[PDB]
Design a protein around this ligand. Structure first.
Ligand SMILES: *Cc1c(COP(=O)(O)O)cnc(C)c1O
Ligand SMILES: *Cc1c(COP(=O)(O)O)cnc(C)c1O
Lengths: 457, 457
C-alpha cells in the first residue's frame, strides 16, 4: 500500500532539505521508515540499514528504546501539557533542569530555558545577548561573530549565524550585524603554517575583525566545540584557549553551540569541558532527548543570569516565551534519555569505541588515493575526498564524489551522510556502538570508497 | 516533597514569560501541575481549577485524553524518530499532510511543512516569502506588514511581526523591514466613524503605507483572522474583503496566522474560511495537536508552491530544514487530535456553546460599570475594563484592574487570563465546554468583576 502513501507524500508533504521538483516528480525517490532497533532502521521495502549517522547526530542511546516510550506515555496520561508561564512547572521539568546543571553542564552554569529545536535555542541566545547589553546600558554592543562552515540553524537570524551558503540562498542572509571569522580547519590553513601558527592566525584574524568592527559594537562569539554539519572539523590544539583570550580582552560573550557535542557524543559530558571552553551561554538539543521527543535547552551562566535577574527589578518580566517551552512529555523523554546515558555509561562507551572507530578509519584510509583527510573525535568521524591531497584541490562539485560514496554505502546497507559543501563522508553513530559494529561500518565504507575511486580516478 | 522541587525550580529553571527576580526570590510563588481532566487542572496543593483559557488557547479537545497518549505511545514504540530530509517520511506524517489539506485547509492549499512552534512556523513563512520573490527576480519585494497588537511569536524576526511592546523590550525590535498598520478594533476607532467607515479607514491606511514604502518593496501582509493575544479583537464586518482588495491591487501575499483560529476554535474549520480570507500561506500550531505534543504546520498555497517547485530545477534544493521537522510522535498526536475533533464535532460544539457563552457574557456584563466592551467569536471572548466607556478612557495601568480580576477569578477556582497591554480578561476554553460549564465560568467572572469594581470605583 506504499504506492498510495507516496502519491500523497508527493502531492502534499513539503519535506525539509529536499529537492522540491525531483521529489514531486518522483525522480528523487521517497523512503518510508517503518521501524528501528539498536543501530538499524527498517524501510518500506523491508531493508534493514545500519544507521551510522544516528538520524542526524541525535539518536544517541540507539533506536527502539521502549523504556523512553514508557516514560513519554506515563507523562502523556498524567499531564501531557500545561504552560510554564508565570512560575508554572511540572515535576519533570524541574528535575531535568537540576540534573542538567548539576550532572552535565560545566562549572558556573545556573539556569535552563527550554524550546523545541536547536534553531529556536540559538534564536533565544540572540535575544538574550541583546537584552544583556541593553540593560547594562551598552545599546551598541550587539554584533555576533560566527565562523565559516559553522552550523547554528535554519532560521533567518540563526541561518545568518550558519556559515554554509545553502542556508543563505535566496533568503538574503547573512543579515547585517552578523560576521564570520575563519573556519579553524588546519588541513586547509594557509600553506606552510604549522598547528601553533594556524592557531595564532585564527586568533589574530578574530582580533582584527573585532577591531575593524569596533569592540564596543561586538556582543558575542558563537561556536561549536567541534563543527558538525560543516563537517566534522576538529579544532587545532590550543585553538579554544587562544580564542577565549581574545574574547576576554574585548569583553565578548562566548556562546558554545553544543547541539551535537552535548550529552556524551565526544566521550565527554559536553565539548566545552573537553576543550577547556568556559562559555557564558550554551545551546543544546538532539542528544538531550536522543530525538525521542523534540526539546532544546539554553543553559545560562552565572554572569548572564545575574544581569537578567537584577534587570527584572526595574524592567519587569522579560518578554520571551514559547507556548511549548518546557513541554512535559518532552521533559519526560529527556529524563529517561539521561537515565539511560548514565546507567550504561554511554559517555565512556563513546570514548572507547569512538577512539577505536577513528583509529580504524585512519589505518584503513590514510594514504588511500581518493581521501584528502581523515578526521574525528569521540563518536564523530569523517573522510574528506580530494582531487589533489597536497595541493588541497577539491573535485569538481558536479562530479558528486561525496554523494556517490554515500549512495554506494547505502547499497551495501549503511547510512552515512554526504556532508554539504564539499566531498565529505560523515559518521555519527549511536553511542551504543560496539567494536564489531564499528568494524562492519569501516568494511562497508572501504568497499564504497574503493568502488567510487575506481569510477572517478 | 514540593518544597524541595520549588527550591530547585527557583535555582535552575528559567521559565518563559515570568518575572526573573520575583520568581527566584519567591515573591512570585511557583505552581506545579500534577494532573488534569476535562476542563480542570490540579495543582500541587490538590486544588482543582477550571481552565477557562485551555492552557494558552491550545488544549482544544480538553485535558486527560488518554486516547492521544495511546497514539503517542504506539508511535514511540514503532518509530519515535527519523528525519524527513531528502524524501524520507513516516506513514503518520504523510497521512497528516493529506488530512490537513483535504479536510481542514481552505481551497487551493497544496503542501504542508512542519516545525514545532508557531514562532518557527512564522520564521519559515518569512524565509518562504523571500525565496518566492528572489526566484521570481524581484529582489526588492521583501517587506512584511503586520498590525498593531498582532501576536506572531517571540523570536527576533517573529517578535518584530508581533505588535505588542513587551516582545520588543530590550531586543531592538522591530527590525527594519517590518511595519505595522492599524489594529482593526472598532470600539477604539476614530470618534464618530461607523463600522463601514472604519473598514475604509483601515484599507486606506494600509494602501497609504504600501505606497509610502513602495509596492515593489512589499512582499507580504500577515494577520490573525481574530487577534488573540492582543486580546480578542474581532475584525469589523467587511474588513477582510476590503483588506484583500488592497493586497490584490499591489500583489502582496496574504499570510493567515491561524495558530489560534485553526482546527475549530471559532466554530469554523479555520478563521480563513469563516471570514472569507483567501491566504497564500497559513500558519498553524496549538490546536493542531491540542498541545498533546509540540507541532507547527505551514500550509503552502498552489501559487507559492508552484513557484518553489519550478525554481528548484535551476536553483537546486531549498536550504531549509529543522532536525525535528515532521517528528513522528508529534504527527501521531495530531492525527489522534484530529480524529477526536471530527468524531465529536467539536467545531460545531465550539459554534454552539461559544455563541451561548458570548451571549451569556454580553447579558451579564454589558452596562456593568467596570466594563467598556464585551467581545468575542466562537470560543473566544473578552471583557475590556475602562474608566469611561463612552469616552474610551482606560484606567491608569498602575491600578492593575485586569490582573486584579484575573487574581480574583483564580481565588474562586478559575483560570482566565489578564491579557497584556490593557485591562482585559480573556476566555479561551476547551472546545468540549458545555452550557452548564459556561454558566459556571460566567458566575465566577461576575463575582470577580463585582469584587474588583467595589474596590476601585
Ligand atoms: C544540528 C544543529 C542545530 C539543529 O537545529 P534544529 O533547529 O534542531 O535543526 C542547531 N544548532 C547547531 C550548532 C547544530 O549543530
Ligand atoms: C499564539 C501565536 C503564536 C505562538 O507561537 P509559539 O512559538 O507556539 O508560542 C505564534 N504566531 C501567532 C500568529 C500566534 O497567534
Amino acid at each position: 500500500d506504499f504506492d498510495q502513501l507516496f502519491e500523497q507524500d508527493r502531492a502534499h508533504f513539503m519535506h525539509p532539505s529536499t529537492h522540491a521538483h525531483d521529489h514531486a516528480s518522483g525522480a528523487l525517490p521517497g523512503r518510508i521508515i517503518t521501524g528501528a532497533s539498536g543501530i538499524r532502521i527498517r524501510d518500506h521495502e523491508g531493508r534493514e540499514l545500519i544507521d551510522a549517522f544516528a538520524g542526524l547526530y541525535c539518536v544517541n542511546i540507539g533506536y527502539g528504546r521502549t523504556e523512553v516510550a514508557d516514560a513519554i506515555y506515563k507523562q502523556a496520561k498524567e499531564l501531557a501539557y500545561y504552560h510554564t508561564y508565570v512560575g508554572h512547572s511540572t515535576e519533570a521539568i524541574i528535575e531535568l533542569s537540576s540534573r542538567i546543571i548539576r550532572d552535565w553542564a560545566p562549572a558556573g552554569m545556573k539556569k535552563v530555558y527550554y524550546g523545541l529545536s536547536g534553531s529556536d535555542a540559538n534564536e533565544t541566545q540572540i535575544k538574550l545577548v541583546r537584552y544583556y547589553n541593553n540593560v547594562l546600558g551598552r545599546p551598541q554592543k550587539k554584533k555576533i561573530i560566527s565562523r565559516q562552515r559553522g552550523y547554528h540553524g535554519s532560521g533567518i537570524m540563526t541561518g545568518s549565524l550558519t556559515g554554509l551558503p545553502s542556508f543563505h540562498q535566496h533568503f538574503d542572509l547573512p543579515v547585517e550585524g552578523i560576521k564570520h571569522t575563519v573556519c579553524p580547519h588546519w588541513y586547509k590553513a594557509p600553506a606552510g603554517m604549522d598547528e601553533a601558527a594556524f592557531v595564532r592566525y585564527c586568533a589574530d584574524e578574530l582580533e582584527k575583525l573585532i577591531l575593524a568592527e569596533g569592540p564596543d559594537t561586538v556582543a558575542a562569539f558563537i561556536g561549536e566545540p567541534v563543527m558538525g554539519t560543516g563537517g566534522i572539523i576538529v579544532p587545532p590544539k590550543g585553538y579554544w584557549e587562544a580564542i577565549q583570550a581574545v574574547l576576554n580582552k574585548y569583553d565578548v560573550l562566548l556562546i558554545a553551540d553544543e547541539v551535537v557535542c552535548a550529552f556524551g557524543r565526544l566521550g565527554s559530558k559536553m565539548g566545552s569541558q573537553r576543550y577547556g571552553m568556559r562559555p557564558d551561554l550554551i545551546t543544546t538539543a538532539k542528544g538531550l532527548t536522543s530525538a525521542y521527543a523534540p526539546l532544546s535547552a539554553v543553559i545560562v551562566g552565572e554572569k548572564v543570569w545575574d544581569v537578567i535577574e537584577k534587570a527584572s527589578q526595574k524592567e519587569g518580566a522579560m518578554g520571551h516565551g514559547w507556548t511549548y517551552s518546557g513541554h512535559p512529555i518532552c521533559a519526560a523523554a529527556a529524563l529517561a534519555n539521561l537515565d539511560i546515558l548514565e546507567r550504561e555509561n554511554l559517555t565512556a562507551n563513546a570514548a572507547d569505541v569512538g577512539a577505536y572507530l577513528n583509529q580504524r578509519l585512519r589505518e584503513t584510509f590514510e594514504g588511500h588515493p581518493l581521501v584528502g583527510e581523515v578526521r574525528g573525535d569521540g563518536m564523530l568521524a569523517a573522510l574528506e575526498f580530494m582531487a589533489d591531497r597536497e595541493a588541497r584541490t577539491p573535485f569538481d562539485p558536479a562530479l558528486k564524489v561525496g554523494p556517490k560514496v554515500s549512495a554506494a554505502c547505502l547499497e551495501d546497507g549503511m547510512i552515512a551522510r554526504a556532508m554539504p559543501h564539499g566531498d565529505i563522508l560523515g559518521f555519527a553513530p549511536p553511542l551504543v556502538l560496539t567494536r564489531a559494529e564499528a568494524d562492519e561500518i569501516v568494511g562497508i565504507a572501504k568497499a564504497a570508497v574503493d568502488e567510487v575511486a575506481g569510477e572517478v580516478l
